Symmetry: D2
Subunit: 480 residues, 4 copies
């Protein structure tokens, strides 16, 4: 048995009645419990994430099967059997909190590894490429996909206007308008790092790397019809499914694979290996198994742990570095930036965000300083041998720059259409029919000029693709 | 034709490419356009409303048919034909911003009148009563109804635990589990002030008042099955419908009616006329037509106008005052309190929230001061005749207090069950069947002791009501 | 030896050099350490307190010498010898952080007692009365005393305009313009509760109470000349002094005394005993010794503990209640209201603000939730016997209301001049000379009409007072 | 004559009395005027600037004498007689908002030019060099200079520890410990851009540029003793002096001069021309007159205009670009980053911060959206010719990168001591005596090891300098 109390620790005499002038009179200002309780209720909410607002979290463990020391000095990958705790958040993208999990969208697949050398965030999606290749375009892309700023309803005419004028999107749309645009749930789902990263070993040798998560539950997708049937009765089915599997002991898992590519292979590929609109061939760059992640624990509080979770692609650990991918480069900035706004300057002290590794530095103060700081010395260099100092064993690599000027210019070999065609031809006939169907339903109401340009981009990917879509939309493409 | 610019007014040379070390190299920090554009994107979101997060807005006009000056000095009601601009937001209640509009919930019906003596907010719902009668319980009620804080899914076992132990909720639940718990859309929907308010005329005479909005489009409700079928294909159907009606010139309207009751009728009644779990008989207190509101304009920007809209029951105008309703009394505080958090100290300067009537006072500063203040005199009293002064013509009434002590105590004559029974018996057989069906689907999975208490509360309302529910749930109540 | 780390717990390789294109080229965006370290620096500051922005803090102990159980059930005062930890912050009032501690001002004297039944804040000043008697005037008062909103310099013409038109200020001004307006430091300084509070004993009997703190170091004040001399060489001498006394083991102490008055004595006094412009005669209501507070420990971090400290007069404990003092009533609201803005919705979790007594309630979420919440049940009533419940042993008293109606009306018996005259006559001749001298230096440049009104208000206090001021100002008041 | 009103536009009947239970009873919650007025009061303050918190603002005009089009395409410099409106803020550095203006510190000299091609901010100081050359050290340097985080008092032992271990500071300290470390006021003061910038003409030719402001009122300084004499009686003397000069029509002015250097001079010099611890010789790179800035208008409201002013070195206009200076490079980020926290995401819409030039872009939303946004198109590219587009005429230059790797490495030819010695020798004997006096007073109490290292750094600058300081401090340096 426990007393209800105020936040001052005073036991509450009456949690039912306001303080009033007699039993039916107006309410007095001197009712600290009422005002405190209502005032905190009035401040429960924080801004939702600007994208990926809808999602669900879980904790688990990553275990190494094959040590990666030949290729990276990353501590958490250094030996067979090494276990690292994770927190993972899965998500949709475009719509707000509360939106259904039956909508078409990439799915987020964000993994935080609590390593001995710091927290490493691999902020992935299910699909292995993206719509754009430069972060400067991201608020534009998002804005076109988001509900219309007047109507508050998503409008295909808007995002297809953007996408069609942004032909590098063509590969991505060829994945997203398959039925893999609606995963059945978060467990029966692919994961991808999407970007190329750099792996750096103890000799300072660098390889390019891509990451892939393969579900133990397999990949399963929903047709537009299957999605509607679920949406009718449950707008949070994926969140429900994740929690329920874990509560029942049916723990979902993913095997982590990598592809590894020499830096020098740039110059002979007909695409840029750091163009995130591109995948690498699995015949030429085979998947190499690293280990397995099992999710086995539900959070204790959704707001405190899942809503407040902060991941960033710039949370890199020794041995794992960014590539020059211009999309990734903006993400390095944007995540901690938005987090400072969404969560507070001190967001890294929220428990789910805290490292397991020691934190010692000369930062101070900021809203909601709860960590009981002490000491006189908050500056470096200083005369004190016991105060924290830099450790040169932990310098990052020095990537070679091939450019000689500060420029704003598109990458060479954009090759916007080739892999979209390859993906299209890789589909089964049943999968091609679904792609055309889903695209037709999406395009049939859009501005005729935009609809033609869409068809033309898919035609440039593959002639059969573009002709089938034109036929299905009733568009005459003879004059082109 | 216009230049894209930074926020500094510098035309942008290139809105496609980040600044990088050659065409494929990493990104430079000296890219003000990138950083400014990402950083503002990173800050787009504000907190959603703590309740009524999902909603839709429109502007229109309210026109007086019968002047109300014999009963209230309110300026906007003073003359036949007098027109006042309104802004209205409709909403659901429990789930977050992106949640479906097919869910069971009261609907918000919030009307801001831009009167010549200040803004008057009538913050109603469709349903004319509430679950609780004291604001001290509001965070409890809400927390029970909201998604479970662990699972992020709404759980009937939680809110029925609260509601069953809060028997004053019985009248409300008897309305909400009719099919009027799911209005077809926002246009074919009732509105209610819910609370008794005080109307005060130019002689200082006071009457109790209740407000009712009657839709010109009639009232239409959804069954659970009808709601699921809509939910399958559109999770924002009510938002859509409102915008669409107005864009097509099919303007929805409501007639405003009032009931008026003398203060001295308190002892004539077997309930407290200021208990918001109670309605007043329309036979004994007939509806009196006041005027008509027509919504005829969509907002120009949903975030700026609808998301940032702030209504409060305490935005009262001369002639219209709060009653002693202890629920209303807490609302007086909570709304501006939450708005200062959600929107900023200076939220009243946001255009939708601004009055038409002149604002002159000695308040100053606060985040985002955009109003070009001037002058040396920010205090009163002062020696300057031209600075703003109090105006004793605009004093409020002085309600009589019947109590002699500051107490925490439930009102007399709570009468928790009688009107719920009256409402139940007022239903058609088809309506009673839908009530029992909807209750049964909601209660069938809850804790057995809670389920029995629910049945017992409804039995106390009406024996046939409670027995039908018990039969439908398979619960044997012979022995009570 | 310790590593400098990022907030992700990654050791920093180089805390000296930004990451650049060669040894002298422009800086790269991919420099997580630079950006994290700059961004947090960029966010160190929070709003200063709206008043009492300049101050200093210390911890210590309060020990009961005489149990107060005949008069109050407060736990911390129950037993001889009982020791309660305290935190105390002393302050100036008007000017910002960084301002000098040599200025004329009341001084704040805010004591947090960490009691077994919750935190009790006694938020005092050195002077025992105040300028105003209704919180509605506080923003006016402050704005008149604050630097002019155009020039950013304090202007006697502005605050004397307010004070002269606010004749209830006369008693306060008669204390503040003695040399006690500039205490020598925080240790050699009086403290006062200012308001009457209500003490309630185990039988439910109530007495009015006033609190006084008497410095073991005695009271010492600065002349205007002494204050200038200190200001020349140290703008933070009181902060320095408090820290230095404690660091050297010379702990400052205060004895706590109370006056006690029966409720009934209202009706026979020629003032309102809950008017905070009034004192109670020490002859008629003798000081009674309660105990001693000794301050013996400096905080470990000024920002975390002293800057973030939050006190409120509404942090009352069983046995100690607010009086009807209309000034106090507004304070009850204002402090936690400003604190939610200044510090965050969760400011009560900041260590210095935490109670020693257990906190259990159904509040949740809000910015910077750091407390590891858990459990499904965040509402009451609920079916669970182990969840926190109200405890009727801890109900507050039920003060009798003498009023009939909700009114806006000045108290009866304002008696604005009589005590100011009594205070003036209680001064030694040296002390009267100082008062006139300090008043004259303040008023000599003020608007002539305001200057005359000042003289008249002091003349009404005491003829010799007003005449001496008029003489010193060169103002002939014979014609009145 | 005007009514005082609430923020809802309702006239206030009584601005004197709270609403209470009779004339002396406790206060009611239903007092919207009290609560609104106190709530807004409670929220007046925003965070002060993290440095330069104390300052003062004015408006004026800049007029071109000698057009600069041969060297820069900047619009505001394009024609003789061209006038551009400015806003200027002057400041101290280290202590908080209310701190004296008699302290030793650089002075800030921040000029916002409202040009036809956007706002251009030249965020200078009086002194023409800086303590450090990499932004990574800025939070350290500041934390060392700031009041100690335990005592809240500035401690020379802390900042000399930092500075002595940061020998690139030696030139700066040689200026700051002259009497120019305490300017007599803001008018009789030098201004400097400090950094080298790049000027780019219409043919794309680039020169390095330095900016210098020469006061028409001449340069005048205070000795330590003259500063204390002022401080005794006025802790805002420089704020007062600026406002007073302008109010009386005695407008302060500065002539702008530039120095111009070819990029190809790098190897001709024994320092890096982009090292901000360095000046350029005026013999080798003569001062060239541009024009004159006159300050002739005080702001209408200090908070709205001066306190909320936001400047950034990244507010560059076509023709004027950053150099590679690594200190500058971090400032490009830090200012808009801190301003988003201090002022809000929409701080650029605060009037003093608004450009004169048109602003059109696809940014949206954020706290306190006051700008009445409209339209459906918030993304680019789009199909609409009338929506804002990029303008390639306004591309920036493409600086040549000399580096081939991403590195963290000190510049070549740091040359930490030579210019400090040149400055020392440039001093008159009276000036040398002051410098030694001021340094001795500052160093005499610091840790002996730190004090010796200080002397050694000054000795390396000039043997006489170091020897005179050693003699004055009583330190025998014969053994070295
Ligand atoms: C209606 C009258 C008053 C109002 C509305 C008011 C309001 C405030 C506010 C808003 C603060 C800043 C609190 C914070 O930021 O944590 C403050 C601080 C303070 N006030 Fe008042 N005040 C009033 C009267 C008084 C009185 C009568 C006293 C003493 C008897 C007093 C003593 C203090 C002290 C000592 C502080 C500093 C607390 C600290 O050190 O953190 N005030 N006041
Ligand atoms: C890396 C080096 C530096 C960093 C990181 C830095 C950072 C900052 C920051 C964060 C502010 C607060 C701005 C605000 O809140 O709006 C500021 C203000 C200021 N800094 Fe710096 N600073 C640096 C070097 C300098 C230099 C070199 C100068 C002059 C050349 C200077 C002059 C100023 C001035 C004048 C202000 C006040 C502007 C105003 O009046 O509002 N700082 N600085
Ligand atoms: O952050 C994102 C924004 C838009 C689309 C995506 O798939 C995504 O992950
Ligand atoms: O504000 C609200 C909270 C909970 C239920 C409701 O119907 C409501 O309107
Ligand atoms: O909070 C306050 C405001 C004005 C004057 C004071 O003495 C005070 O404490
Ligand atoms: O921004 C700043 C920080 C520290 C010292 C300075 O001179 C400065 O301008
Ligand atoms: Cl650090
Ligand atoms: Cl006001
Ligand atoms: Cl609670
Ligand atoms: Cl944009
Ligand atoms: Na191995
Ligand atoms: Na010329």
């Amino acid at each position: 048995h426990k007393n209800l109390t105020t936040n001052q620790g005073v036991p509450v005499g009456d949690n039912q009645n306001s303080r009033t002038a007699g039993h039916r009179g107006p309410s007095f200002l001197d009712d600290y419990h009422l005002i405190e309780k209502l005032a905190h209720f009035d401040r429960e909410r924080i801004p939702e994430r600007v994208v990926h607002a809808r999602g669900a979290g879980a904790y688990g463990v990553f275990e190494v099967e094959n040590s990666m020391e030949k290729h990276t000095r990353a501590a958490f990958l250094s030996e067979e059997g090494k276990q690292t705790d994770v927190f993972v958040r899965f998500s949709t993208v475009i719509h707000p909190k509360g939106s259904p999990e039956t909508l078409r969208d990439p799915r987020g697949f964000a993994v935080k590894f609590y390593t001995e050398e710091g927290n490493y965030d691999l902020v992935g999606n299910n699909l292995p490429i993206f719509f754009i290749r430069d972060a400067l375009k991201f608020p534009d892309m998002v804005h076109s996909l988001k509900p219309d700023p007047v109507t508050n309803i998503q409008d295909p005419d808007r995002y297809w206007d953007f996408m069609t004028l942004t032909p590098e999107s063509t590969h991505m749309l060829t994945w997203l308008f398959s039925d893999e645009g609606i995963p059945a749930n978060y467990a029966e789902m692919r994961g991808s790092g999407v970007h190329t990263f750099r792996w750096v070993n103890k000799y300072g040798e660098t390889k390019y790397v891509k990451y892939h998560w393969r579900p133990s539950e397999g990949i399963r997708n929903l047709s537009m019809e299957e999605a509607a049937e679920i949406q009718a009765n449950d707008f949070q089915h994926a969140t429900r499914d994740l929690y329920d599997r874990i509560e029942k002991g049916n723990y979902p898992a993913w095997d982590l694979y990598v592809q590894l590519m020499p830096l020098s292979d740039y110059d002979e590929l007909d695409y840029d290996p750091c163009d995130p609109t591109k995948t690498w061939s699995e015949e030429d760059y085979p998947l190499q198994k690293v280990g397995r992640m099992t999710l086995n624990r539900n959070p204790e509080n959704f707001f405190a742990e899942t809503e407040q979770a902060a991941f960033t692609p710039s949370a890199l650990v020794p041995g794992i570095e960014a590539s020059e991918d211009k999309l990734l480069q903006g993400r390095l900035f944007s995540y901690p930036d938005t987090q400072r706004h969404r969560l507070g300057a001190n967001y890294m002290r929220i428990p789910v965000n805290c490292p397991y590794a020691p934190v010692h530095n000369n930062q101070q103060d900021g809203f909601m300083t709860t960590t009981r700081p002490s000491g006189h010395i908050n500056y470096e260099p200083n005369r004190y041998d016991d105060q924290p100092k830099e450790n040169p064993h932990y310098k990052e690599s020095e990537p070679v720059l091939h450019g000689d000027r500060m420029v704003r210019q598109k990458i060479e070999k954009p090759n916007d259409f080739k892999q979209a065609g390859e993906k299209y031809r890789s589909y089964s006939e049943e999968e091609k029919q679904a792609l055309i169907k889903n695209l037709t339903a999406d395009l049939k109401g859009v501005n005729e000029k935009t609809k033609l340009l869409a068809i033309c981009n898919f035609y440039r990917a593959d002639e059969d693709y573009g002709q089938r879509l034109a036929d299905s939309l009733g568009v005459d493409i003879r004059s082109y």
